[PDB]
Amino acid sequence: FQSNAMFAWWGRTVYQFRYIVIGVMVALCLGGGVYGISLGNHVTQSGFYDEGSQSVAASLIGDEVYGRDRTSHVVAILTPPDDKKVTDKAWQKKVTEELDQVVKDHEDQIVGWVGWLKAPDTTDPTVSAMKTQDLRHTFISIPLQGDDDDEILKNYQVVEPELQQVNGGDIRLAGLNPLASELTGTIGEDQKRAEVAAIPLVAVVLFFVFGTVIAAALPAIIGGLAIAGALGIMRLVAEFTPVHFFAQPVVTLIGLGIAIDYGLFIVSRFREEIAEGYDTEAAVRRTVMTSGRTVVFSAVIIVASSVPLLLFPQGFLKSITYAIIASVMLAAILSITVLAAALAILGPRVDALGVTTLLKGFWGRLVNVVMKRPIAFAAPILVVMVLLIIPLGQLSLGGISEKYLPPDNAVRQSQEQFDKLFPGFRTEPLTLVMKREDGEPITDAQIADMRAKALTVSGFTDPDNDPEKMWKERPANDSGSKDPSVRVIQNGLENRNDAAKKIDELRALQPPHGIEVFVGGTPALEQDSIHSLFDKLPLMALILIVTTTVLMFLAFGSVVLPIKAALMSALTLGSTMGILTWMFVDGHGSGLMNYTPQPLMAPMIGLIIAVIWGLSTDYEVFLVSRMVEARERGMSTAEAIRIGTATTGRLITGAALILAVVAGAFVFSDLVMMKYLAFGLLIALLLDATIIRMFLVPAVMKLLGDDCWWAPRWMKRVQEKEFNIFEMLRIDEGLRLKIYKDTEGYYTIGIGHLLTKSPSLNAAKSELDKAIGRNTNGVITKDEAEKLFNQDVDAAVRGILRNAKLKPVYDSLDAVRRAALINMVFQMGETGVAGFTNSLRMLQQKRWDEAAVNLAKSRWYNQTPNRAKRVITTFRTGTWDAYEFHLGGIKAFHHHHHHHH
Numbered sequence: 001f002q003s004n005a006m007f008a009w010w011g012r013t014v015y016q017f018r019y020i021v022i023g024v025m026v027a028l029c030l031g032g033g034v035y036g037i038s039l040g041n042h043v044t045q046s047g048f049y050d051e052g053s054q055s056v057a058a059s060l061i062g063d064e065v066y067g068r069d070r071t072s073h074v075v076a077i078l079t080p081p082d083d084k085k086v087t088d089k090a091w092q093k094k095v096t097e098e099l100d101q102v103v104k105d106h107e108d109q110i111v112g113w114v115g116w117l118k119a120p121d122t123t124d125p126t127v128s129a130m131k132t133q134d135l136r137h138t139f140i141s142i143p144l145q146g147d148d149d150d151e152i153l154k155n156y157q158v159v160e161p162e163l164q165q166v167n168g169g170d171i172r173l174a175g176l177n178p179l180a181s182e183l184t185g186t187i188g189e190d191q192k193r194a195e196v197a198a199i200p201l202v203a204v205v206l207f208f209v210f211g212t213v214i215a216a217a218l219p220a221i222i223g224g225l226a227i228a229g230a231l232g233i234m235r236l237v238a239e240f241t242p243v244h245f246f247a248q249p250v251v252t253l254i255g256l257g258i259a260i261d262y263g264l265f266i267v268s269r270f271r272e273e274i275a276e277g278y279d280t281e282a283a284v285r286r287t288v289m290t291s292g293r294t295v296v297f298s299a300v301i302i303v304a305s306s307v308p309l310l311l312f313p314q315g316f317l318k319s320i321t322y323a324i325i326a327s328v329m330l331a332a333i334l335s336i337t338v339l340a341a342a343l344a345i346l347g348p349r350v351d352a353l354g355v356t357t358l359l360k361g362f363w364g365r366l367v368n369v370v371m372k373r374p375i376a377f378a379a380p381i382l383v384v385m386v387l388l389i390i391p392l393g394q395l396s397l398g399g400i401s402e403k404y405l406p407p408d409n410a411v412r413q414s415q416e417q418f419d420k421l422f423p424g425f426r427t428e429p430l431t432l433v434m435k436r437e438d439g440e441p442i443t444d445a446q447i448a449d450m451r452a453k454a455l456t457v458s459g460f461t462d463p464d465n466d467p468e469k470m471w472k473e474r475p476a477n478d479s480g481s482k483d484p485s486v487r488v489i490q491n492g493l494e495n496r497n498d499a500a501k502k503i504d505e506l507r508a509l510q511p512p513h514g515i516e517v518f519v520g521g522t523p524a525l526e527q528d529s530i531h532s533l534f535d536k537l538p539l540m541a542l543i544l545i546v547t548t549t550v551l552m553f554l555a556f557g558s559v560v561l562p563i564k565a566a567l568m569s570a571l572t573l574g575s576t577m578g579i580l581t582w583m584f585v586d587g588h589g590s591g592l593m594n595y596t597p598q599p600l601m602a603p604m605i606g607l608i609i610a611v612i613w614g615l616s617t618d619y620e621v622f623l624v625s626r627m628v629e630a631r632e633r634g635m636s637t638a639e640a641i642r643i644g645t646a647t648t649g650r651l652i653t654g655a656a657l658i659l660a661v662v663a664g665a666f667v668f669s670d671l672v673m674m675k676y677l678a679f680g681l682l683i684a685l686l687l688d689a690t691i692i693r694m695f696l697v698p699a700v701m702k703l704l705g706d707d708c709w710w711a712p713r714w715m716k717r718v719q720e721k722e723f724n725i726f727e728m729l730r731i732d733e734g735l736r737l738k739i740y741k742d743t744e745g746y747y748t749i750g751i752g753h754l755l756t757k758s759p760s761l762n763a764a765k766s767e768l769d770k771a772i773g774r775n776t777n778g779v780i781t782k783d784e785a786e787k788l789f790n791q792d793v794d795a796a797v798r799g800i801l802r803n804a805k806l807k808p809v810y811d812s813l814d815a816v817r818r819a820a821l822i823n824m825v826f827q828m829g830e831t832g833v834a835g836f837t838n839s840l841r842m843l844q845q846k847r848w849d850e851a852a853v854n855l856a857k858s859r860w861y862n863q864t865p866n867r868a869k870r871v872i873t874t875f876r877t878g879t880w881d882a883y884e885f886h887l888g889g890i891k892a893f894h895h896h897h898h899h900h901h
């Protein structure tokens with residue numbers, strides 16, 4: 001197809017422009033990094049709700065007209081010391097004056113403080129309930145300035161240190177903002193843990209995979225450049241659209257490790273090509289094509305896995321999707337630009353340093369034992385994996401809670417103690433946001449209409465249970481427009497699980513003539529977000545599976561192998577998900593890992609599907625692409641499966657561990673979503689690297705035999721010219737379809753075929769006419785050029801076999817190397833080639849490197865380097881590589897020895 005041509009071209013190009021390529025990109029990545037460390041201050045917490053939903057609309061209109069609810073912003077429990085009681089007016093006058101001072105110094109941050117302590121002598125029942133009956137505790141509400149979740153949080157964090165200093169420190173902060181501050185604060189300490197724990201462990205695995213530090217350090221450097229540039233990109237993205245807090249760790253959680261993984265396969269392929277006698281220039285090229293195709297494909301596949309998340313309306317998922325795309329794409333680009341150019345500069349110098357630089361057939365035999373008893377391995381694996389999908393039915397979803405923090409988090413407990421000491425104040429009522437399209441006020445009888453319709457609905461709370469007093473109007477503060485065209489009534493909920501049922505019932509209520517009813521509230525926001533997820537989820541899965549399977553099909557050529565991978569990834573997914581619900585819903589490991597068993601966040605299930613599927617699909621490509629390579633190379637399905645396994649065995653383990661290590665740092669996050677996400681990686685990865693790669697894939701793949709490989713769509717993949725000795729010497733000696741004079745001035749034609757040494761052109765035409773058995777008047781076709789070439793080769797080979805000095809080395813050589821030997825014979829004759837007694841002897845003993853080195857010291861190499869180097873490289877590698885990608889064209893044509901007639 002189209003894809004195989006470009007990687008070749010780019011392979012020669014990264015070498016031709018090494019220093020420029022490595023200079024521009026590192027500058028950009030470091031430039032991005034310096035630009036992208038400011039990411040963290042242009043970062044949002046919002047985006048968990050469905051922006052196009054009625055609840056959000058109800059919220060928007062509600063905060064617009066009535067003012068946003070700031071009563072729950074900051075809540076502070078106060079405890080007088082020395083067992084003094086809250087009613088102690090001496091303690092009151094001192095504490096309140098402290099409070100007034102904090103407000104006085106921060107009017108740009110704090111609206112004020114509300115509570116019993118402001119007017120201790122009130123018979124207002126609700127206000128008098130802001131103190132416990134034992135008079136040991138009293139709480140205040142501290143509404144903050146700001147017009148979005150982010151500004152309000154920043155305002156809290158400004159006043160928090162001085163606020164915590166109230167009452168001699170004996171004050172406990174809780175509410176929306178102390179939790180938000182703690183929840184978002186987990187990001188910063190999760191990455192620090194990654195720098196402290198993950199980074200040194202990555203270096204160990206990196207050095208484990210390779211044998212030297214330079215080869216080990218390069219993927220690490222790529223990862224860092226990927227992070228830097230991706231953070232820079234994400235910073236740029238923050239200029240045009242909100243970027244969530246959670247986007248940052250995703251860059252390091254996913255991008256880094258995957259960037260290391262990509263770099264791991266490039267350096268390993270380069271090292272592998274240098275192991276063969278390939279030039280540095282050649283190694284980078286071949287490496288780039290093979291590895292790049294897999295890495296480039298792997299990146300696009302993850303992009304194809306992340307893009308479907310854009311179907312979901314949660315801005316949370318959009319920011320993360322961008323971050324993933326930016327990361328893995330920059331990773332792929334870096335791994336075939338900066339890294340390739342670096343290897344081109346280094347060459348074999350990658351294997352310079354060893355463990356000692358101090359300053360400060362297992363897979364072979366593991367894969368074949370499986371193959372002849374594949375079903376003994378398949379069946380039990382698939383049963384468990386399906387049985388690991390059984391805890392999935394218990395999966396539940398919910399909104400953000402204080403339970404998202406660990407049970408021993410001080411801020412979570414301040415909250416849990418607020419709800420324990422003051423049980424009534426924490427409410428989440430459903431709202432009926434009424435809006436007349438008409439611009440005139442809503443009458444009292446019009447609200448009476450809606451209340452009557454609302455009182456009809458069954459399960460709303462009735463403390464103080466008169467219906468008249470149910471569905472109170474939402475409190476209005478100074479931030480509201482107070483437009484009489486909009487009025488909001490709200491009631492709490494009885495039994496709060498059933499919100500979806502009663503929300504949908506509130507919307508089924510027919511609005512009094514001429515009004516649009518917007519049903520909102522925290523459970524409404526959360527429910528709409530959940531419904532939005534389930535709605536776009538079947539479509540996501542569709543696009544997710546199709547795009548990746550198609551991409552794997554362009555990467556493999558097989559139709560079956562990609563479809564096989566789809567089922568594999570689906571079962572890896574379903575199994576990993578079941579274990580997670582087993583872990584985070586049923587709470588298995590919750591004690592060990594210090595998290596609370598609870599419903600999972602709805603958009604989190606979208607993210608984890610995409611990440612797992614994309615990661616699972618990549619690790620199939622990492623493995624199968626080699627198998628495919630083997631088959632294309634031409635091998636039975638059996639050994640094709642094996643070759644692919646043994647070649648990538650150590651590599652995929654290291655690639656897995658490096659990613660597993662970083663994930664294993666994030667599993668210790670105080671944020672359950674992060675814990676949950678990080679575990680999804682580990683579990684899916686461990687299942688992929690072991691159960692899938694080593695057992696289930698090679699087992700299955702053999703069952704299909706050669707059916708696994710390309711099946712249908714004949715001609716979908718193009719058979720390609722298989723290089724030959726003519727094409728070889730077409731390059732070295734030229735292909736001329738018309739009689740011409742060579743450098744010695746003699747009439748030559750075809751591939752270095754001397755017609756005659758006669759000055760007479762007609763004599764040459766006469767001999768040419770004779771040779772083709774047809775009047776040519778000096779012109780032949782390509783077929784006749786080959787026909788004549790083959791006679792010359794036959795003559796060359798005949799004489800070679802009659803030469804005692806040439807026959808033994810020739811008989812021992814494979815077809816390709818024979819062509820190189822024949823090439824030499826053509827250029828200098830048997831006696832000329834026979835003069836190479838030692839190198840011939842080295843070739844007969846298959847000491848290619850020794851022969852290649854010794855042949856380069858010849859006068860033959862000196863007088864004709866490009867052809868010699870081409871022939872020598874062919875001896876060394878035994879492949880048509882030096883000819884399949886030769887530089888240019890040759891200018892001086894010379895007729896060869898052994899012109900037959």
Ligand SMILES: CCCCCCCCCCCCOC[C@H]1O[C@H](O[C@H]2O[C@H](CO)[C@@H](O)[C@H](O)[C@H]2O)[C@H](O)[C@@H](O)[C@@H]1O
Nearest residue numbers: 045049056059063068069070149176180183184245400
């Ligand atoms: C890294 C993980 C971090 C997780 C952070 C979660 C911690 C607690 C969340 C804090 C949310 C503050 O909730 C309180 C507010 O909720 C709604 O407004 C919010 O929802 C609307 C529709 O979306 C938006 O229009 C408003 O801008 C937006 O303030 C209400 O209308 C407001 O009356 C109320 O004040």
Ligand SMILES: CCCCCCCCCCCCOC[C@H]1O[C@H](O[C@H]2O[C@H](CO)[C@@H](O)[C@H](O)[C@H]2O)[C@H](O)[C@@H](O)[C@@H]1O
Nearest residue numbers: 071072075114115126127141174175176179425426427
């Ligand atoms: C996940 C985190 C969840 C955290 C949950 C936290 C919920 C906290 C709820 C706090 C409700 C406290 O409300 C306190 C009271 O303030 C105002 O009283 C007025 O008293 C004086 C005479 O009017 C004047 O100073 C002012 O006009 C005004 O203060 C309202 O008029 C009352 O109706 C309201 O009851």
Ligand SMILES: CCCCCCCCCCCCOC[C@H]1O[C@H](O[C@H]2O[C@H](CO)[C@@H](O)[C@H](O)[C@H]2O)[C@H](O)[C@@H](O)[C@@H]1O
Nearest residue numbers: 233237239240241242321322323325326327329330333
């Ligand atoms: C090398 C690998 C490269 C990989 C990098 C991947 C990054 C992809 C980033 C895609 C983000 C595109 O942003 C899309 C968003 O932009 C818009 O802004 C404009 O509309 C806003 C109101 O909507 C107003 O504030 C303004 O009029 C205006 O700025 C809106 O926010 C969204 O309606 C829209 O969805």
Ligand SMILES: CCCCCCCCCCCCOC[C@H]1O[C@H](O[C@H]2O[C@H](CO)[C@@H](O)[C@H](O)[C@H]2O)[C@H](O)[C@@H](O)[C@@H]1O
Nearest residue numbers: 193197198406593594657660661662663664665668669
């Ligand atoms: C499969 C391949 C292997 C991959 C796994 C590699 C893992 C590498 C990272 C491991 C670093 C260990 O970090 C230990 C972390 O825990 C400590 O105590 C806490 O421990 C649990 C929560 O962290 C709870 O017990 C409590 O909340 C609290 O006591 C500190 O609070 C943290 O500061 C410290 O960072």
Ligand SMILES: NC(=O)CN(CC(=O)O)CC(=O)O
Nearest residue numbers: 835836837838839840854858
């Ligand atoms: N193949 C060669 O270049 C051998 N030459 C050169 C050498 O290796 O000394 C000498 C010989 O004829 O044995």
Ligand SMILES: NC(=O)CN(CC(=O)O)CC(=O)O
Nearest residue numbers: 732864865866867890891892
């Ligand atoms: N004559 C040329 O320009 C090509 N050169 C190639 C070279 O110098 O190595 C000689 C040949 O191929 O016969």
